[PDB]
Amino acid sequence: GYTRERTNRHFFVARANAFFSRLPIARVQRSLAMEAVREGRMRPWKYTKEQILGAPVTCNFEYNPRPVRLIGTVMDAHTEETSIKGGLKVYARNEETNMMLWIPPGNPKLRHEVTSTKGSFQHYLDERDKWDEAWITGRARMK
Amino acid sequence: PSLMREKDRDMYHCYYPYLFDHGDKMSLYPKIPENPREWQPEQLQTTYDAIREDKYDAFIRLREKFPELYQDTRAWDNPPPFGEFNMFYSVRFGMVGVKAFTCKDYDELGNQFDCTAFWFPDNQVVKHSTRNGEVGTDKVYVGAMNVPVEFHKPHVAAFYKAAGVPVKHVCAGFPITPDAYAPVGTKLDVRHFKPGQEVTITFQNTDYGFRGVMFRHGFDGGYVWLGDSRWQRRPGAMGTEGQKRIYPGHRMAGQTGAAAETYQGVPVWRIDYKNSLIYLPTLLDADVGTYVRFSDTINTKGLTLWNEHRGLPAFPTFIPPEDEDLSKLATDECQLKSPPLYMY
Amino acid sequence: QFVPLHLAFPRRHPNSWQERQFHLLGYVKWPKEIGFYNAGDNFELTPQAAYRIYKQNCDETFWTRLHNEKTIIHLLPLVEQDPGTNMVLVDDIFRHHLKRFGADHYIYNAVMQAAAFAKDFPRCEQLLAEMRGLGLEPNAQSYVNMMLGARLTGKPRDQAEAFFREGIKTGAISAVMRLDTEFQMWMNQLERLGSFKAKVGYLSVNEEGASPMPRDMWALWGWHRTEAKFISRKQMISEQVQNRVRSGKELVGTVYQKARRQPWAKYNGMFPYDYNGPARRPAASFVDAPTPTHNAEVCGTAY
Amino acid sequence: EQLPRVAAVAAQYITGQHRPDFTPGMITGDHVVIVNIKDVVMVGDQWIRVPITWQTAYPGGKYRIRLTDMYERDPCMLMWWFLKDEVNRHFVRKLKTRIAP
Amino acid sequence: LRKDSKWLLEERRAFRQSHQRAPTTKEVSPHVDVALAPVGALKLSKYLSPCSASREVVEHSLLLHRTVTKSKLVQSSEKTLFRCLRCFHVYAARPRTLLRGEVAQSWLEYEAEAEKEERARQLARRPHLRKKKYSIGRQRASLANDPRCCPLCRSTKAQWMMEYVHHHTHG
Amino acid sequence: DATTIALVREQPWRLSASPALFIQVLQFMALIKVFEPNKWFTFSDHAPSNRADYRHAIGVNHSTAFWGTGEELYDFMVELLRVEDDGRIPTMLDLCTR
Amino acid sequence: LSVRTEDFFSKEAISHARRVSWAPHTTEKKQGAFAKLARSNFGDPLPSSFAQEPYFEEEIEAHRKHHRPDVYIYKYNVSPTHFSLRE
Amino acid sequence: DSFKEHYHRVHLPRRLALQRYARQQSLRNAAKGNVKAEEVPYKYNRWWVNEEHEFVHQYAFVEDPEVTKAKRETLPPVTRENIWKEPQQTFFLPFAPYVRVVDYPKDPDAKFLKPVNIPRWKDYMQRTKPVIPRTWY
Amino acid sequence: EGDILRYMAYDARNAQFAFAPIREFPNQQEFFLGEHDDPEKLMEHVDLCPLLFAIPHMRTVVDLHAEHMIPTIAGPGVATSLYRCIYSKALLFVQVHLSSEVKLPPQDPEAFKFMWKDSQVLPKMRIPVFVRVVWPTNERMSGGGGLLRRFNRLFGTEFASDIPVDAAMALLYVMQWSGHIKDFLGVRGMRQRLADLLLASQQPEPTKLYPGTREIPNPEYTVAERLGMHVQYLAQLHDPDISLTIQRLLPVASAPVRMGCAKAALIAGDRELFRHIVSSEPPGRMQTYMTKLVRKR
Amino acid sequence: LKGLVYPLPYYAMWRGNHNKYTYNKSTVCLWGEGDTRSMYHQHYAHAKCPTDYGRGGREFEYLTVKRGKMLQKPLPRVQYVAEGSKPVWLFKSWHTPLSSPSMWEREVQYAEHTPEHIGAKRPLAVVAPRTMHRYLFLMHMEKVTITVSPLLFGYGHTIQKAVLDFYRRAISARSPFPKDKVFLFYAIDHITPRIEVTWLDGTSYVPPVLEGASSQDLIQMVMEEAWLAADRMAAEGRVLNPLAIDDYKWDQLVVFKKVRDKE
RNA sequence: AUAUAUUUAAUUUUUAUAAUUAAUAAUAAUUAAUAUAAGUACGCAAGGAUUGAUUAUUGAAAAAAGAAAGAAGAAUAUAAUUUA
Ligand SMILES: [Mg+2]
Ligand SMILES: [Zn+2]
C-alpha cells in the first residue's frame, strides 16, 4: 500500500565530519604501516615514480610444495612512501606468456623485492611496447 | 525445535521427580480436597505411595552422595540467581560509533580483507526507559560525541540538562534485559566488544536523490510483472480475471538511498582501545561521518553467540582496571586482533 | 496435527442444554429435605429421608442387609451429633435386621462404627464379644472400628495397639511393613479423617454444594466423553446387571486392558443432538403433592 | 450463553434500542460490561467450521481464519466482531452511528 | 564441481514427478563431472601443419568438446577462475550467472523468468521489503559476488581459465 | 515522575507521616491536569486533541502516547486512604485536621 | 572449550516414572544388556511412540494392589495408603 | 481504520487500565506499611521427555526489583583480565571430533584395536546438541 | 579444596587419549590380571589403592551396556585408563579388552530374545583385564635384581629387575584385595594355562544347559572358546614365539580356536600368518567375520 | 520478532515468526492444557498439578519471563522414617537380570519398612512385573488341590468350564513333573469349586472364582500371587530355584516359530 | 499513433528516543545436498546403506514531535590552517 524510503531520524542524519579533527587518522595509518613493517609483511620504501618506474623486481608467492617465483619489470608504483595503501604494477613474461600483475604490499604469503631502486626508462619503454603489442595481438585474434 | 504439547506435561513424561504445588510446601501427591464431598467417585486420594517415595528417596540420596556423577542434575533445584550473565536471557546494550575510514589488512593464511575502521568518541550511558513497567519493555539510551552547549537545539539541550549527563551529539536506544543495566553516566570503553565477535550494525547509506527505474533496481527494474488472475490450464471452459489496478509494490523510479540500512552478523577484525577504533572486514555504503550503531548478534546457525565454547562477554559492560593509563600506554600496545578465519 | 480433532475447551453446550439433558436422562429434582447434589456434584441423601425410605421399604422384597448398612451409614453423622435419640433409630434398624436377616458382619460392623461415633467403647467391646460368641470372627473392618472408637473416646495408643496386634494375629489385617509403621499409618489416616466435631478432621468440613441439579451435566469421571458421570437409567441398569454378571473380570487389571482403555482411537463426532440440543422430554410433575405448609420456613442443613 | 445471542442482547442495550425515547439520530445507550468471555460457548463443530474472512490492500490478501484461531489469538476479538455485525445490521450508513456504539 | 543449491533442488523435484520415487544420490549427481580435452589432442593439432588434411577432422573434434565443456560448466555455481578476452583480465566468477547469456538454454531461460516472478511476489507482498533487500549497498555487493562482466572492461565475453591454461601449457 | 519515585518506591512513609505534603501534592496534581493529557496538546476546545490517548503501529505518537505520569502516585494515595478500613484506626485521618 | 567425552557419547532420555533406578549402572538402555548377552549390536529405530493420547491410571504397591482390605468409614474407603469415595 | 486497528485503538487504554488495576493489588501491600515484592512459585517440573523419547527443557526466568535497583545504582565490578584479553573463538568446534588415527593400535587398519574413548563417526555427525543431562553448551 | 580435588579426579576421566602420556618412559611390561564379568569392580579396586595417586592422567569408565561398548565378535574397542604411582612415579596402563570373544551372533535374534527373556539367571562373561607397567631405567630405585628375583621366587610370579618396587607392591596389593591373585599371572603362567586348556580340550567336555546352535548359540563359554581367548591373551602379552605357537597349533584347532588365532595374529601384527589362516579356513560365517575384522580394499 | 529478542534460538518458531499477542491468557486447548483445570479428568487430576496448566496448542512456552522475587519452595520430605535410622542400600545393575525380584526390590530400604511378623530380614518388593500370565509355573509352588463338583453343570457352566480349563492348563504348565504337584478332587456334594494352593513355605491362598472369570484370569491371579509369595520367601531367606531354559521353553518356542512363520 | 481519472513509486526539509496493534502460520514448506560420512551393512561376485553438522541462500520482513523565501558548500572536500 504505502512505504517510506527516506528517514529524517536525528541519529541517522547527524554527522561527525566537524569532530573528525580530534582523531589522528593519518597517525593511525602510519601506525598500521609501522606494525606491518615490524611484523615483516612489508618493508619500507622511499622512491619516486620516475625512479622506480623501469626497475627489475622478483616476487615469490609462497605455496606448498613449491613457492612460485616471478621476475618482472616494474611498470607503475602507486605510492612513493610506505603505507597500508601501497600498490605496484609489475610485468613479467614467461616462455610465450605475458602477464601484468598489481602487487599489493603487506601480504605475508607474498614477498616482492625490487633488485634496484634505480630504473632504466629505455627498458621501461621496451617492456611497455612489448606489452601493448601483445595486448593488441590478443584483441585482434579474439575479434 | 522439538514440538512438546502442553498436555504431555504429566508426571509420566517428566525427567525429574514431578513435584505438585500443594500450597506452601511442594509435595509428591496431588492436593487432596479439603472438603470430602468434592472427592470424585473414581478419584483415588493418595496419601502415601511407596513407589514414588522410594524413587524420590533414591534420587535425593544419589544427588547428595555423588555430586560429581550427578552434577548436571543440580539444575533441578538451586537455579542460577538473577543478576548473573545468562546464556539465553542476558542481552547487553551496544554502542554508537562513527565510520572513520577504510583500509586493507591481510590474515596469516594470505586472505586480503578490505576493512573499515569506525571510531567511538565518547560512549556514555545517558538514559533508562521502560514503558509502564512491563516485562522486556525496558531499554538503555547511550549517547555519543560530546558537544558544546551552543551546538544542540534548545529542546534537546533541555533534555540533556534534565538528565545531567554531559550533552552528547547523538543518542541511540538499545532494548535490553533488566539484569544488564549500567548507572547513568557510565563511560563505555571500546573493549566492551571482542575481536572474535559477531556484530549487527545500523547506519544510513549515502543519498543519490531521484534516480531512474533502471539505476534503482538494476536489471530487475526493466521487467516488473505479477499476475494473481486465474487462467485456464486446459481448454475445457472459459474464465479469468482482469488485472484492473497495479498491485502495490510495483518497482518504479523514486528516492534512492538515504535509508536505514542494517548489516547482520559481521565479525570484528581488530580493536584499538587507545583511539577507540574497531575494524570490520565489510565495506559499507554510508558516507564518512555517519553515526553507526553497533549491537550484539543474538545467535547464528541455531547457536548462541555467548557460550563457554567461544567465550564469555564483558557483562554488563567492560570497566578498565585502575592502574591502567591509556595516556602512558602506546598505540601499538593497544591492538587486539581476532583469531584467523577463512571465507572462500 | 495442529488442527484439533476433539476439543475440551471451549465448551460445546450452553446452559439450557444442561436442564434439557437432566430431564432427558430421567432424573427428578427432589427437594433439599430429600437429597441434593453436593460440592462434588454427587447425589447425597439426607439422613432424614434415608430413615424415611428405610421405614417405608423395610418390609418389601427388595430390601437387603446392604440397604440396612447404607441406612446406618447415612445416619452416622446424625448419630455423632446427637447420640441420645439417633441411637434409638440405629437400634430399631438392628432389631429389624435381626428379624429379617439375622447376624451379619455388615450389620455388626455398621453398629460398631455407629457406637464408635456415639462414643460408646463399652458398647463396641460388647458388640465385638457378641460377634466372637456367635462365631463371626472379627474382620479388618471390625478392628478398624475398634481403633476408631478408641481414638475417638480417648483410649491410649497402647489400647489401640492391642486391637491392632490382635487383628494382625487373627490375620484379618495384612501388613507389609513393620507393625509400628503400620500402626502409625493407620493412626495418621484416622487422624486426617477426624470426627464430625473435631475441627481438624475432614469430617469437620460441613460445606455442601446445595444444588438440586449438578452444574455441569457433561462432567467426566474417567478418560473419554463416553465415560460420563451422569448417564441415562437404561445404561445405568446395564451397568448394574454387568456388575453382577461379569464380576470376575473386575479382579484383575492387565496392561492389555489398560492400554486398550486409551480413547486415542475412539470416535468423537458431533451427533444430531450435539446440534439440536438434548432431546426434549417431559419432567416428572408433582401436581399431586400437597401444598407446602411450611414454605416460609427455611430448611436446615443435612447434618 | 452463545456468542450470537449474547452479542444481540449486548447490542440491544448498547445502541439504546431498549429505551422508549430512542431516536435514530441521538446515539445514546447503556454501558454493558461483558464478563467471562473466555468461557463463552458455541455449539459443536462451529468453532471449526465458521469462517471469518476479510480483505487487505495487498493483492490476493484474502485472510480467512477459523473461530478457533481467532479465539486462541484473542477471545475478545470474537465478541467484538459479533457486536460489530449486530450493530452494522442496523447502522452501516454513518461512520458515527456504526462506530460510536 | 558442486551444483547450485537452487538447481539441485530443481533436479530432486523433477525426479520425483518423473520416476515417482525418491531421488538417488548417485543419479542426481550433485557434483558436476566436467571432462578436459585429451592431452594428446591439443598436441595433435599443434604439430599438425595447416596444410594437413587430418587437421580439420581433429579441429572439429576439439570445437565440439570445447562447447560441451561449456554445457557442463554452466551447471555449477562454485567460485571459478574466469578470464575475459576483451581486456584480458582474470577474475573469480560463478559459471552459471556468467555463462548464462552464451549457453542459450531454455531451461536456464525459464528459471530466470521464474526467479524474477519469485522476487516480485515477495516485493509486492511487502513494499518496504525492497528497502532492506534491494539497496545500493546490497546491489553493489551482489554484483561483486556474481561478476557477470569484467570489472575492468565491462564485457560479458569470458572463458574458463582452467581450459585456457590446459590449452596453453600443452600447445 | 521523580516525585513519584521519591515518595512511593524509596520513601513510602513520608505521605502518611506528613498530611500537609499529601494535600499539597494532591492540590498540585489537581491544578495541573494530569489525568487528561489530551488537554496538554489541544489548542482550541472546539477540537480536542488525541496526542496522548491515540497511537498507531506505523510509528505515530510513540514517545508522547500513554504516559504513566501520576497513575502510580494516585494509586498509592487512594491506597493510603483505604488503609483505614483494614487497620481499624485512621492514622492519616487522625493525623490530619478537619 | 576443550573436548568432553560426555559430549562424545550420547545417553538415553527416559522419563523418571519409567526409570527402574537412578544408578549409573542402569542409566543406560535396557536393550543393551540383551545385546551384550547376544554378542550383537542392535539398531532398531523408533521402537514405540507413546500414543496420540497417552493415558495411564494410578498404580500402587504390588502387595497392596491385591491385598486391599474392605475397610470402610462413614462414606469413604480408607486404606493405610489411600482414600476414595464409597457410593 | 480496519477492524483490528479500531479494536486495538479502543482496547489498548483498557488494557493499560487493567494492568494498573492488577498492580493496585500489589500496591495494597506497600500501602499497609509492609512493602513486599511479588513472589512467584519456582516450578521444578521443566525437564521433560517428549513423545519421540527426546529431552526438552523449559526456560523460566524471573526478575528481581531489588537486584534491578542495585544494578542501577552500584557500578559493576572490574572486568576480568583474561576475559577481556583472550579473544572469542571464531569457528565452533564440533561436539565430537573424528580423529581417524590412534597411535595405540599396533595395526592402525585393525578396526577392533582402536580404543573406545575415541568418538565414532555416528557421534561426530549426530551430536550437534548437548547431552540429555547437560543443557548449556 | 576437597570438592576441587574430587572434580579434578573426575575430569581425569574426561581427559582425552592423545595428550595422555602413555609412552613416556622407556621400559614396559604387561600383566594379565584375570577375567571378570563386571570389570568396573576391579577398576574401583585399582582406583582405591594407597600406592597410587587419586588423580589419574586418563580414566575411562567401562560400561558393557552402552551400544559403543558392547562386546561383539568384531571387537568394538579396548577401554584404556592411566594411573601414576606416588613414590616411584611409574605409569600403569589398564586395558579392558572386548575383542577377546569368538562367539558368533545368532541368526534369528528374536528366538534368542524369546529364549533368554524370562530367564532369571544370566551366565557370567569372561572379559580380560591387562596392565602395562611403564618405568624408566632405574639402577637403585628397584633395589637391585636380587630383591625382585626373591619376590618372584616367593610369590610364584615374574617381574622385571628394573621394575619399581612401588608399582610391584601396588599391583600385588590390588590383586590380593580383589582376590584374583590365583588368576593373576604373566607370560610364564599364561603358557601353563594354555597347556592346561589344551589338556582340557583333549579331555571330553560336559554338557551345558543346551547345545549351542547356529540359530540359538550358548552364551556359556566352551573349552575351545576359552582356548582361543587365552591365545589372544598370550598374543597381547607378546610372547616371543607366539607366531610359531600359532603355526604349530593351527592344524589341531577348531573354528572357535582359529578365530582367536586370527585375532591373535592381528594383535601380533604380521600379515602373512593372518592371510594364511584366512585362506586355509573353509568358507563360513567365521571366515566372513574375520575378513570383516581388518580393513581391506 | 520485534521488541526484545532473547538469545534463545527458535523459541517462537512454533508460534510463527512474531512475538505478538503475549498478553493473552486463554487459548484453545485439549485435555490437560489451558483452562481445563476447572474441569475434572481422572488421569490429569493425579498426573498434573492444577496450577501447572499453561498455554495450549502452538502457544506452548519454551521461554517465560516474569517479574517479582522468586519464592523457591522446599522439597518434599520423606515420611514414615525414623530419625537416625541407617538404611541398607541395594546396588542395582543390568548385570542382574530384570526378572529377578532384587531389581524391583526397594533401593533405599530402612529397618522400619521390614516386616517382622512375616519373619523376613528385608522389606518386600514394591512394584510387580507386568506380564500376561498365560501358563502356570509350579516351581515356587508346593502343591495345588482343585476340588470340583461333577454332579450338575447346568448350574455352573461358566464356572465349571473355567475351573476345568484352569486344571488342564495347570497339568500342562511349566514344570518338570506337574502331575506330581497338581491334584484334582471330585466332591459329589460341594457348594462351589475351590482351588487351594500351598507354597514351599506352606501358606494357603484361595483365588476367588466368580462368574465371568476366565481360565486365563485365574492363571493370572495365581501367577501374581505366586510372584508375591516368591518375593516373601526370598525376603524371609528361603532359597528358590531360578527360572531358566527348559523343555517347556522349547515346546513354547515351537509355537513361537509357528506363529512367526504364520505372520 | 494527444497532456486525463482510479491505482502505484516517491517527497512534505536534524524527529535525542523504532515497531507491545494492519503485513492473521512459513522469505523457502525450519532447509539442506556435500568431502568425512563408508573401500563399510546389503550383495557369490560385480558392485552397493540408511544419514545429518563444519563447506551454502537460512536476521525473514514497515525508523511519522519544535519556530524554514541564500549554496543544507561561504564552495579550490580543514567548520575558519597565522590572515592588512
Ligand atoms: Mg524539520
Ligand atoms: Zn576485462
Distances from the Cα of I253 to the Cαs of B152, H32, I231, I258, I280, in angstroms? 100, 95, 11, 6, 12
Contacts of C187 (CB under 8 A, 6+ apart): C147, C151, C157, C160
- For residues H118 and I20, what is the distance between their CA atoms, to the nearest angstrom? 13
Q: Cβ–Cβ contacts within 10 Å for residue J153, how many?
A: 13
Task: Cell numbers for C138, please give them.
Answer: 472379627
B273 close to B191: Cβ distance less than 8 angstroms: yes
Q: Are D47 and D67 in contact (CB under 8 A)?
A: yes
Cα–Cα distance measured from residue G76 to residue B45, given in angstroms and rounded to the nearest whole number: 10
Q: What three-state secondary structure class fits A68?
A: strand
C-alpha angle C96-C100-C106 in degrees, rounded to nearest 5? 80
Q: How far apart are CA J31 and CA C7, in angstroms?
A: 8
The nucleotide lying nearest B245 (C-alpha to C1') is: K7
Residue C10, preceding bond cis, omega within 30 degrees?
yes
- Residues H89 and I147: their CA atoms lie apart, in Å, by 56
In contact, I63 and G28? CB cutoff 8 Å: yes
- 8 A C-beta contact, residue I18 and residue I58: no
Q: Is E149 a known ligand-binding residue?
A: no
Tell me the C-alpha distance between J220 and J162, whole Å.
13
- Determine the residue type at I130: F
Note whether A14 and B169 are within 8 A (CB).
yes
The dihedral over CA atoms of E133, E134, E140, E143, expressed in degrees to the nearest 10, equals: 80
Determine the Cα–Cα distance for residues B256 and H16; give it in Å rounded to an integer.
Answer: 40
Give the sign of the dihedral formed by CA J110, CA J112, CA J116, CA J117: negative
Q: How many CB atoms lie within 10 A of CB E24?
A: 10
- Say if strands J141-148 and J108-109 run parallel, antiparallel, or are unpaired: unpaired
Nearest 5°: the CA angle E163, E165, E169 is 125
Which residue type sits at B41? P
Chain K positions with an atom below 7 A of a protein C-beta are 6-27, 30, 33-34, 36-41, 48-57, 59-67, 72, 78-80
Q: How far apart are CA J159 and CA J163, in angstroms?
A: 6
Contacts of E20 (CB under 8 A, 6+ apart): none
Asked if G18 contacts I52 with a C-beta cutoff of 8 angstroms, the reply is no
Q: Is the separation of the CB atoms in G19 and B11 below 8 Å?
A: no
Angle at the Cα of C189 (from C187 to C192), degrees rounded to 5? 110
- J69-71 and H39-41: which strand pairing? parallel
Query: How far from C76 is each of B123, B284, C206, G76, CA to CA, in Å?
Result: 81, 89, 14, 13
The Cα-based distances of I58 to C229, E135, I95, I163 in angstroms read 64, 57, 12, 22
Residue C246 and residue C238: Cα distance in Å, rounded?
A: 12
Give the residue from C160, C222, C218, C162 showing the smallest Cα distance to C191. Answer: C160
- Which residue type does C136 have? L
With contacts defined as CB-CB under 8 Å, which chain G residues touch B15?
13, 15-16
The torsion region of residue G38 among left (phi > 0), alpha (psi -120 to 50) and beta comes to alpha
Region of residue C194 (phi > 0: left; psi between -120 and 50: alpha; otherwise: beta): left
- C-alpha Rg value of chain B to the nearest Å: 30
Residue G51 has which C-alpha cell? 500414543
DSSP, collapsed to helix, strand or coil, labels residue J174 as strand
Decide: helix, strand or coil at residue I35.
Answer: strand
- By the CB < 8 Å criterion, does H117 face chain B? no
Backbone dihedral angles phi then psi of residue B151, each to the nearest 5 degrees: -90, -55
Task: Please name the helix (run of DSSP H) or strand (run of DSSP E) that holds residue I187, with its range, or none.
Answer: helix I187-202
User: Is B186:H79 a contact under the CB 8 Å cutoff?
Assistant: no
Helix (H, G, I), strand (E, B) or coil at E110: helix
- What grid cell was written down for I199? 589338556
With 0-12 / 13-18 / 19 or more C-beta atoms within 10 angstroms meaning exposed / middle / buried, residue E32 is middle
Minimal C-alpha gap between B308 and chain J (Å): 14
Strand-pair partners of A93: A98
Residue J136: name the closest of J184, J197, J210 by CA.
Answer: J197
Q: Cβ contacts (< 8 Å) between I67 and chain G: which residues?
A: 29, 32, 35, 41-42
Beta bridge partners of B202: B262, B293
Q: Which of residues 89-128 of H touch I (CB under 8 A)?
A: 99, 102-104, 106-107, 109-118, 120, 123
DSSP-assigned states of every residue in G21-60: ---TTTSS-SHHHHHHHHT------------SS-------
Cα B46 from Cα B30, distance rounded (Å): 8
Strand G82-85 and strand G76-78: pairing?
A: antiparallel
Rounded CA-CA distance C289/B133 in Å is: 65
Helical (H) or strand (E) element with A77 = strand A68-77
Residue C182 burial by CB count (10 A; 0-12/13-18/19+): exposed, middle or buried? Answer: buried
What span, in angstroms and rounded, lies between the C-alpha atoms of B313 and B311? 7
Could you write out the three-class secondary structure of B246-291?
A: CCCCCCCCEEEECCEEEEEEEECCEEECCCCEEEECCCCCECCCEE
Query: Hey, which bits of chain C come out as E strands?
Result: 35-37, 43-45
User: J114 φ, ψ to 5°?
Assistant: -95, 125
To test the contact with chain J by mutation, choose from D35, D41, D71, D72 the residue with the greatest count of J C-beta atoms within 10 A, namely D72
Can you spell out the DSSP letters for D59-71?
TT-EEEEEHHHHH
I8 → chain B, closest CA residue: B68
Tell how far CA J193 is from the center of its chain.
28
Report the residue count for chain C: 303
B/e letters for G9-38, b = 16+ CB within 10 Å, e = fewer, are: bbebbbbbbeebbbbebbbbbeebbbbbbb
Distance CA J221, CA J134 (A): 11
Q: How many CB atoms lie within 10 A of CB B298?
A: 20
What 3-state DSSP class applies to E93? strand
Q: What share of chain F is helix, strand, coil (3-state, %, to 5)?
A: 50, 0, 45
Burial (Cβ within 10 Å: 0-12, 13-18, ≥19) of residue D24: exposed
What is the C-alpha separation between E37 and E69, in angstroms, rounded?
A: 9
Using alpha carbons only, what angle is made at residue C168 by residues C162 and C171, rounded to the nearest 5 degrees?
140
| Closest C1' nucleotide to E31's CA | K34
Q: Does E84 appear as a known binding residue?
A: yes
Minimal Cβ distance to B225: which of E120, E138, E140? E120
Distance CA D6, CA D18 (A): 15
Beta carbons of F92 and F22 less than 8 angstroms apart: yes
Cell, residue H69: 535497583
Cell numbers given for B80: 542460577
Give the count of beta carbons closer than 10 Å to the beta carbon of residue I101.
Answer: 25
C-alpha cell at I86: 606416588
DSSP string across B163-207: H-SPPEEEEEEEE--GGG---TT-B--GGGS-TT-EEEEEEEBPE
Distance CA F53, CA F47 (A): 15
Closest C-alpha among J96, A138, B212, C190 to residue I120: J96
Neighbouring chains of B at 3+ CB pairs under 8 Å are A, C, D, E, F, G, H, I, J
- A117: cell is 631502486
The interface residues of chain D toward chain H in range 52-81, judged by CB-CB distance below 8 A, are 54, 76-77, 80-81
- CA angle H61/H66/H72 to nearest 5° reads 100
Amino acid at B328: K
Which residue, among H136, H57, H69, H131, has the nearest Cα to B86 in the 3D structure? H136
In chain B, which residues have their Cβ closer than 8 Å to the Cβ of C189?
Answer: 47
DSSP-assigned letter for residue E2: B
Q: How far is CA F84 from the centre of its chain?
A: 20
Query: What cell does J120 get?
Result: 523376613
Spatial distance between the Cα atoms of B286 and A11, rounded to a whole number of angstroms? 14
User: What's the start-to-end Cα distance of chain H, in Å?
Assistant: 48
Q: Least CB-CB distance to D57: which of B226, B228, B248?
A: B248
Q: Cα angle vertex B233, ends B229, B235, to 5°?
A: 115
C-alpha cell of residue E115: 526467479
Residues 6+ apart with CB under 8 A from F94: none
- CA E101 – CA E157 distance, rounded (Å): 9
Q: Tell me whether G39 touches chain I (CB under 8 Å).
A: yes
- The H-or-E segment that residue A98 falls in is strand A97-103
Helix and strand totals (H; E) in chain A: 4, 5
Q: Closest by alpha carbon to J45, among B40, E32, C77, A67? A: B40
Instruction: Tell me the technique behind this structure.
Output: cryo-EM
3-class DSSP state for residue H40?
strand
Distance of CA B268 to the CA centre of its chain: 16
Contacts of C8 (CB under 8 A, 6+ apart): J29, J30, J31, J36, J39
Instruction: Specify whether the backbone of I144 is left (phi greater than 0), alpha (psi in -120 to 50) or beta.
Output: left
Q: For residues B95 and B188, what is the distance between their CA atoms, to the nearest angstrom?
A: 8
In sequence order, what DSSP letters do the residues of B89-152 get, joined into one string?
T-----EEEEEEEEEEEE-TTS-EEEEEEEE----EEEEEEESTT-TT-EEEEEEEEE--TTTS
List, in sequence order, every residue forming a beta bridge with B336; answer none if it has no partner: B271
Tell me the Cα Rg of chain C.
23
Preceding peptide of B267 cis, ω within 30°: no
* Cell triple for B92: 547487553
Does C220 contact chain J (CB < 8 Å)? yes
For I81-150, the DSSP string reads EEEEBSSS--EEEEEEE-----PPPPS-HHHHHHHSSS-S------EEEEEEEEE---STTTTHHHHHHH
Q: Which residues contact C293 (CB under 8 A, 6 or more apart)?
A: none
Is H6 in CB contact (< 8 Å) with chain D? yes
Beta-ladder partners of B96: B293
